[model samples]
Target: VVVILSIVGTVLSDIIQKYFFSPTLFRVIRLARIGRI
Candidate 1:
């Protein structure tokens, strides 16, 4: 058997997945468009 894992990277990837790949995307878009220039 062989096993390898990076717990910290796994957590960061989860954050990136949610923030960069979902509602957080629209969140940034809203901030960019809805906020003042």
Candidate 2:
């Protein structure tokens, strides 16, 4: 069903953001600051 799929997709997106995207962006910001030196 459309509703079921939408719920699953939303949960998966939240998980990805918490697990992967957040850490990746933190690393990118750190690397950028290091390069400024």
Candidate 3:
């Protein structure tokens, strides 16, 4: 049961990062690059 829950939590964490965190991170990176340029 613990192993199964761990797997599920990891999968959910990936999906959440992909959808929510990735875009925000990309935007921040893009802005940083633009500022440098």
Candidate 4:
């Protein structure tokens, strides 16, 4: 799933669910920038 400011479809929840993903830091960094709901 894509999780950028322009295309964050279900990625927010997906990221939370996949805390063990390889790009956890990458996702978390973007998540911080997200600051949205």
Q: In terms of lDDT, which candidate is strongest?
A: 2
Model 3 spans with C-alpha error above 4 angstroms:
20-37
Model 2, position 16, has a per-residue lDDT of 58
Candidate 1 lDDT tens digits, 1-37: 1122344444545665776566655564454344233
Per-residue lDDT tens digits of candidate 3, residues 1-37?
7677556555655665677566665554454435332
Off by over 4 Å in 2: 22-37
Clashes of each: 0, 0, 0, 0
Give candidate 4 misplaced runs (Cα > 4 Å).
1-9, 20-37
Model 3 clashing-pair count: 0
Pairwise TM-score winner, candidates 3 and 4: 3
- lDDT by residue for model 2 over 3-29, one digit each (tens)? 775565556556656775666655544
Q: Return the lDDT, model 4, position 33.
A: 61
**Model 3, position 20: C-alpha lDDT score:** 50
Question: For model 1, where is the 10-residue window of minimal lDDT?
Answer: 1-10
TM-score of each: 0.37, 0.46, 0.45, 0.26
Cα lDDT of all candidates, in order? 0.49, 0.57, 0.56, 0.56
| Positional deviation of residue 6's Cα in model 4 after best superposition, in angstroms | 10
Give lDDT: candidate 3, residue 13. Answer: 57
* Residue pairs with backbone atoms closer than 3 Å in model 4 (clashes): none
